[PDB]
Write a protein that holds these residues in place. Structure first.
Motif, PDB file in Angstrom:
ATOM      1  N   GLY B 111       0.795  -1.212   0.000  1.00 27.69           N
ATOM      2  CA  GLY B 111       0.000   0.000   0.000  1.00 27.69           C
ATOM      3  C   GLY B 111       0.822   1.253   0.000  1.00 27.69           C
ATOM      4  N   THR B 112       0.264   2.322  -0.590  1.00 25.58           N
ATOM      5  CA  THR B 112       0.856   3.639  -0.572  1.00 25.58           C
ATOM      6  C   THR B 112      -0.235   4.634  -0.113  1.00 25.58           C
ATOM      7  OG1 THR B 112       2.303   3.211  -2.458  1.00 25.58           O
ATOM      8  CG2 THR B 112       1.819   5.534  -1.954  1.00 25.58           C
ATOM      9  N   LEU B 113       0.047   5.340   0.950  1.00 25.47           N
ATOM     10  CA  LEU B 113      -0.912   6.327   1.475  1.00 25.47           C
ATOM     11  C   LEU B 113      -0.714   7.652   0.767  1.00 25.47           C
ATOM     12  CD1 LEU B 113      -3.088   7.296   3.540  1.00 25.47           C
ATOM     13  CD2 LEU B 113      -1.134   7.946   5.005  1.00 25.47           C
ATOM     14  N   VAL B 114      -1.786   8.131   0.184  1.00 21.21           N
ATOM     15  CA  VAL B 114      -1.809   9.408  -0.458  1.00 21.21           C
ATOM     16  C   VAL B 114      -2.707  10.305   0.366  1.00 21.21           C
ATOM     17  CG1 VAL B 114      -2.482  10.787  -2.490  1.00 21.21           C
ATOM     18  CG2 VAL B 114      -1.456   8.464  -2.764  1.00 21.21           C
ATOM     19  N   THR B 115      -2.150  11.399   0.858  1.00 26.38           N
ATOM     20  CA  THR B 115      -2.883  12.359   1.635  1.00 26.38           C
ATOM     21  C   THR B 115      -3.037  13.630   0.800  1.00 26.38           C
ATOM     22  OG1 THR B 115      -2.046  11.544   3.727  1.00 26.38           O
ATOM     23  CG2 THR B 115      -3.012  13.722   3.731  1.00 26.38           C
ATOM     24  N   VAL B 116      -4.272  14.086   0.631  1.00 30.40           N
ATOM     25  CA  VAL B 116      -4.566  15.329  -0.084  1.00 30.40           C
ATOM     26  C   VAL B 116      -5.036  16.377   0.914  1.00 30.40           C
ATOM     27  CG1 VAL B 116      -5.853  16.437  -1.950  1.00 30.40           C
ATOM     28  CG2 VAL B 116      -5.207  13.988  -2.194  1.00 30.40           C
ATOM     29  N   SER B 117      -4.295  17.459   1.060  1.00 30.81           N
ATOM     30  CA  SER B 117      -4.614  18.489   2.049  1.00 30.81           C
ATOM     31  C   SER B 117      -3.973  19.829   1.691  1.00 30.81           C
ATOM     32  CB  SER B 117      -4.156  18.089   3.425  1.00 30.81           C
ATOM     33  OG  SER B 117      -4.315  19.093   4.378  1.00 30.81           O
ATOM     34  N   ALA B 118      -4.676  20.921   1.988  1.00 33.62           N
ATOM     35  CA  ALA B 118      -4.146  22.263   1.850  1.00 33.62           C
ATOM     36  C   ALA B 118      -3.524  22.784   3.152  1.00 33.62           C
ATOM     37  CB  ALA B 118      -5.288  23.205   1.383  1.00 33.62           C
ATOM     38  N   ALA B 119      -3.481  21.944   4.175  1.00 31.69           N
ATOM     39  CA  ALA B 119      -2.933  22.351   5.469  1.00 31.69           C
ATOM     40  C   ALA B 119      -1.426  22.607   5.437  1.00 31.69           C
ATOM     41  CB  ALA B 119      -3.233  21.301   6.545  1.00 31.69           C
ATOM     42  N   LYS B 120      -0.968  23.447   6.347  1.00 39.49           N
ATOM     43  CA  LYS B 120       0.422  23.712   6.504  1.00 39.49           C
ATOM     44  C   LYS B 120       0.870  23.089   7.823  1.00 39.49           C
ATOM     45  CE  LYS B 120      -0.218  28.450   8.319  1.00 39.49           C
ATOM     46  NZ  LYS B 120      -1.718  28.354   8.423  1.00 39.49           N
ATOM     47  N   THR B 121       2.165  22.785   7.950  1.00 41.90           N
ATOM     48  CA  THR B 121       2.745  22.256   9.187  1.00 41.90           C
ATOM     49  C   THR B 121       2.404  23.175  10.356  1.00 41.90           C
ATOM     50  OG1 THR B 121       4.526  21.289   7.980  1.00 41.90           O
ATOM     51  CG2 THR B 121       4.796  21.480  10.378  1.00 41.90           C
ATOM     52  N   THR B 122       1.763  22.624  11.347  1.00 41.83           N
ATOM     53  CA  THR B 122       1.240  23.366  12.493  1.00 41.83           C
ATOM     54  C   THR B 122       1.436  22.517  13.763  1.00 41.83           C
ATOM     55  OG1 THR B 122      -0.438  24.318  11.048  1.00 41.83           O
ATOM     56  CG2 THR B 122      -0.812  24.537  13.452  1.00 41.83           C
ATOM     57  N   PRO B 123       2.086  23.073  14.795  1.00 39.50           N
ATOM     58  CA  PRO B 123       2.280  22.282  16.024  1.00 39.50           C
ATOM     59  C   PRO B 123       0.985  22.291  16.850  1.00 39.50           C
ATOM     60  CG  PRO B 123       3.171  24.431  16.323  1.00 39.50           C
ATOM     61  CD  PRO B 123       2.806  24.341  14.889  1.00 39.50           C
ATOM     62  N   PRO B 124       0.773  21.253  17.663  1.00 43.54           N
ATOM     63  CA  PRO B 124      -0.429  21.193  18.466  1.00 43.54           C
ATOM     64  C   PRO B 124      -0.392  22.165  19.662  1.00 43.54           C
ATOM     65  CG  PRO B 124       0.948  19.349  19.050  1.00 43.54           C
ATOM     66  CD  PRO B 124       1.675  20.101  17.930  1.00 43.54           C
ATOM     67  N   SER B 125      -1.562  22.607  20.053  1.00 44.15           N
ATOM     68  CA  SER B 125      -1.772  23.177  21.365  1.00 44.15           C
ATOM     69  C   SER B 125      -2.067  22.011  22.317  1.00 44.15           C
ATOM     70  CB  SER B 125      -2.967  24.123  21.351  1.00 44.15           C
ATOM     71  OG  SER B 125      -2.724  25.218  20.474  1.00 44.15           O
ATOM     72  N   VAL B 126      -1.463  22.002  23.499  1.00 37.81           N
ATOM     73  CA  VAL B 126      -1.691  20.924  24.433  1.00 37.81           C
ATOM     74  C   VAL B 126      -2.331  21.479  25.719  1.00 37.81           C
ATOM     75  CG1 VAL B 126      -0.626  19.041  25.780  1.00 37.81           C
ATOM     76  CG2 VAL B 126       0.348  19.678  23.482  1.00 37.81           C
ATOM     77  N   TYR B 127      -3.525  21.009  26.042  1.00 41.76           N
ATOM     78  CA  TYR B 127      -4.277  21.501  27.188  1.00 41.76           C
ATOM     79  C   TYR B 127      -4.477  20.411  28.233  1.00 41.76           C
ATOM     80  CZ  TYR B 127      -5.365  25.178  23.875  1.00 41.76           C
ATOM     81  OH  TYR B 127      -5.294  26.171  22.943  1.00 41.76           O
ATOM     82  N   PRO B 128      -4.307  20.743  29.522  1.00 42.45           N
ATOM     83  CA  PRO B 128      -4.456  19.743  30.577  1.00 42.45           C
ATOM     84  C   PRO B 128      -5.917  19.498  30.906  1.00 42.45           C
ATOM     85  CG  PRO B 128      -3.940  21.890  31.541  1.00 42.45           C
ATOM     86  CD  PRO B 128      -3.960  22.069  30.061  1.00 42.45           C
ATOM     87  N   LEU B 129      -6.235  18.266  31.283  1.00 42.35           N
ATOM     88  CA  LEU B 129      -7.555  17.822  31.714  1.00 42.35           C
ATOM     89  C   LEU B 129      -7.452  17.252  33.105  1.00 42.35           C
ATOM     90  CD1 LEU B 129      -8.642  16.110  28.310  1.00 42.35           C
ATOM     91  CD2 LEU B 129      -9.119  18.480  29.022  1.00 42.35           C
ATOM     92  N   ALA B 130      -7.946  17.972  34.092  1.00 44.19           N
ATOM     93  CA  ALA B 130      -7.810  17.535  35.474  1.00 44.19           C
ATOM     94  C   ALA B 130      -9.115  17.731  36.208  1.00 44.19           C
ATOM     95  CB  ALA B 130      -6.729  18.358  36.147  1.00 44.19           C
ATOM     96  N   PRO B 131      -9.388  16.902  37.228  1.00 41.46           N
ATOM     97  CA  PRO B 131     -10.502  17.212  38.118  1.00 41.46           C
ATOM     98  C   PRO B 131     -10.164  18.371  39.024  1.00 41.46           C
ATOM     99  CG  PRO B 131      -9.247  15.437  39.012  1.00 41.46           C
ATOM    100  CD  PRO B 131      -8.705  15.663  37.653  1.00 41.46           C
ATOM    101  N   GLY B 132     -11.181  18.936  39.654  1.00 44.51           N
ATOM    102  CA  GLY B 132     -10.983  19.989  40.628  1.00 44.51           C
ATOM    103  C   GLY B 132     -10.383  19.433  41.893  1.00 44.51           C
ATOM    104  N   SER B 133      -9.725  20.314  42.613  1.00 40.85           N
ATOM    105  CA  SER B 133      -9.022  19.954  43.826  1.00 40.85           C
ATOM    106  C   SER B 133      -9.943  19.300  44.866  1.00 40.85           C
ATOM    107  CB  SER B 133      -8.383  21.211  44.426  1.00 40.85           C
ATOM    108  OG  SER B 133      -7.856  20.905  45.688  1.00 40.85           O
ATOM    109  N   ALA B 134     -11.189  19.769  44.925  1.00 40.57           N
ATOM    110  CA  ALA B 134     -12.142  19.305  45.946  1.00 40.57           C
ATOM    111  C   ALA B 134     -13.187  18.359  45.392  1.00 40.57           C
ATOM    112  CB  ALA B 134     -12.819  20.521  46.663  1.00 40.57           C
TER     113      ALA B 134
END
Lengths: 217, 218
Positions: B111-134
Motif C-alpha cells: 500500500g501507498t498512502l496518499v494524503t490530499v490536504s491544503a494544510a500547513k505544518t502546524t504544532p499542536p496546542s496541548v491543554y491539561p484535563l484535570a478534576p478539581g481539587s475538591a
C-alpha cells in the motif's frame, strides 16, 4: 454489480474456540467455465490485505489450515477451527466471476469478554485554552464492553452542541474493552452564554444513561 | 519470493498530481495483470480496475474514469498509478495486486498512502484535563491531555516519559478542520496523584516540537 453481503458485521470470538462468518452473493458465483471465483482476504490492523482462500475452498500456501472455506452458488462460509490472536482483523470476501470485481463490506473479529459500563469523566475548558479565546469540553467514556455506545451533549438541559469531535479506540490489547472521547468545542464567548454542560453516555449495560455535568464556575 | 513493493507515502495539495509505483519481482512481469484497489481511511476495499501487462491496455471501473491513469515500465517490472486534479476524497491507501489464473488479487503490495490536504505544518496546542481539587474521589482518578489543531500526523503521546502506560488511552486523531485533534486519558490510583507528578508528553516531529504538560488540579 454483484452485491456481496457479509454477516455479521462484527463477530465476537474466543481464543481457542471456533468461529464462522457468512458471505452471500446476490447472484451465483458459479462461472460458465466451471469454477466459482469466491475469495477470502484478511486485513490485520495496520497491515495490507492478505489472500487466505481462493476458489471457495483452496488455501493459499502458508495460510493456516485452521481456516476452511466452503459453500456454493450464492452462499459461502469461512470457518476457523480454533481462533488465535493473530486471526483478529477484518475479513473480506470478494468475487471474480462477474465484472466488476466486488468486495463484501468486511466482518471484523473481536474478542468476547464480560459486559462493562463506561467510566465517564467530564472536563471543563482549561484556563490555558480560555486565555486563547477557546473552550473545549472533553468527555471520556472509558473501558466499556460491548463496543456500541452513544454520546449526547446538552447545554442548559437542551440537546445541543456545536463542534463535536468523536474518536473511538480499537479493542484494548490489555482488557478487551473499548473507549471513546467526545470533545465539544465552543468559542470562549459562546461558552460564557451558558451554564450547564452535560455529557450523556448510553450503553447496553443500563437502561439509564450515565450523566456527567458541571456548572460553569 | 513473489513480491510487489510500493513507493512511500505522498502528501499533495488539492488540484495537484501524484504518481505512485508498484515494483514487482520474483516472476515474469508481463505474464500477469496488475490490479489497483483503493481503501479510504477506516473504510473498505474498492476495486479500481487493472492494467494488462502484455498489451499495456488499462481498464477502469466507472468510478475511476477521468482522473486516473495506470501505466507500465515493463523493462523495470513496474506498474504506476497516476492521479490527476487531486481531491480531498482521493485521500486513501492505494494497493497494487497481481493476478494468478485462479484469482485476480493473489499477491498484494503493502500500500501507498496518499494524503490530499491544503494544510500547513502546524504544532499542536496541548491543554491539561484535570478534576478539581475538591472533587469527590474514588480508588482511581482520570486525567488527560487535549492535543488540538496540528498537522501533519503523527504526534506521539506519552505519560511520565512512558512510565505510565497501563492506564492510558490515546485516541486516534480526527480532522477537526484541515487540522487534526486528539486526546489522551490516563487513569491512576487516587493515592498516586496528586501525591506524585503526572505529565503528558506530546511530540510532534514535523514541527520539531515536544510539549510537556504537568497535570494539576483544575
Amino acid at each position: 454489480d454483484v452485491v456481496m453481503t457479509q454477516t455479521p458485521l462484527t463477530l465476537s470470538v474466543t481464543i481457542g474456540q471456533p468461529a464462522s462468518i457468512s458471505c452471500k452473493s446476490s447472484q451465483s458465483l458459479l462461472d460458465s467455465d466451471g469454477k466459482t471465483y469466491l475469495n477470502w482476504l484478511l486485513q490485520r490492523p495496520g497491515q495490507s490485505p492478505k489472500r487466505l482462500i481462493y476458489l471457495v475452498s483452496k488455501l493459499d500456501s502458508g495460510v493456516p489450515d485452521r481456516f476452511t472455506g466452503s459453500g456454493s452458488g450464492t452462499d459461502f462460509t469461512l470457518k476457523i477451527s480454533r481462533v488465535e490472536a493473530e486471526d483478529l482483523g477484518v475479513y473480506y470476501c470478494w468475487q471474480g466471476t462477474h465484472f466488476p470485481l466486488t468486495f463484501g463490506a468486511g466482518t471484523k473479529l473481536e474478542l468476547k469478554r464480560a459486559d462493562a459500563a463506561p467510566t465517564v469523566s467530564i472536563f471543563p475548558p482549561s484556563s490555558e485554552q480560555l486565555t486563547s479565546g477557546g473552550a473545549s469540553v472533553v468527555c471520556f467514556l472509558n473501558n466499556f464492553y460491548p463496543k456500541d455506545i452513544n454520546v449526547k451533549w446538552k447545554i442548559d438541559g437542551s440537546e445541543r452542541q456545536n463542534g463535536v469531535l468523536n474518536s473511538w479506540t480499537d479493542q484494548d490489547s490489555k482488557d478487551s474493552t473499548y473507549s471513546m472521547s467526545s470533545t465539544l468545542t465552543l468559542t470562549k464567548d459562546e461558552y460564557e452564554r451558558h451554564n450547564s454542560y452535560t455529557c450523556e453516555a448510553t450503553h447496553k449495560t443500563s437502561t439509564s444513561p450515565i450523566v456527567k455535568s458541571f456548572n460553569r464556575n | 519470493q513473489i513480491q510487489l513493493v510500493q513507493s512511500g507515502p505522498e502528501l499533495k495539495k488539492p488540484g495537484e498530481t501524484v504518481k505512485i509505483s508498484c515494483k514487482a519481482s520474483g516472476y515474469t512481469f508481463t505474464d500477469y495483470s496488475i490490479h489497483w484497489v483503493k481503501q479510504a481511511p477506516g473504510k473498505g476495499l474498492k476495486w479500481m480496475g487493472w492494467i494488462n501487462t502484455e498489451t499495456g491496455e488499462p481498464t477502469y471501473t466507472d468510478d475511476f474514469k477521468g482522473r486516473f491513469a495506470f501505466s507500465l515500465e515493463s523493462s523495470a517490472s513496474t506498474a504506476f498509478l497516476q492521479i490527476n486534479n487531486l481531491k480531498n476524497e482521493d485521500t486513501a491507501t492505494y494497493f497494487c495486486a497481481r493476478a494468478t489464473t485462479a484469482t485476480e488479487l493473489a499477491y498484494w503490495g503493502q500500500g501507498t498512502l496518499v494524503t490530499v490536504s491544503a494544510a500547513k505544518t502546524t504544532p499542536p496546542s496541548v491543554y491539561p484535563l484535570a478534576p478539581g481539587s475538591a472533587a469527590q474521589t474514588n480508588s482511581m482518578v482520570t486525567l488527560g491531555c487535549l492535543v488540538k489543531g496540528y498537522f501533519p500526523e503523527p504526534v506521539t503521546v506519552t505519560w511520565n516519559s512512558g512510565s505510565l502506560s497501563s492506564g492510558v488511552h490515546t485516541f486516534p486523531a480526527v480532522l477537526q478542520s484541515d487540522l487534526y485533534t486528539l486526546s489522551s486519558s490516563v487513569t491512576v490510583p487516587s493515592s498516586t496523584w496528586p501525591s506524585e507528578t503526572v505529565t503528558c508528553n506530546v511530540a510532534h516531529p514535523a514541527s520539531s516540537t515536544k510539549v510537556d504538560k504537568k497535570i494539576v488540579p483544575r
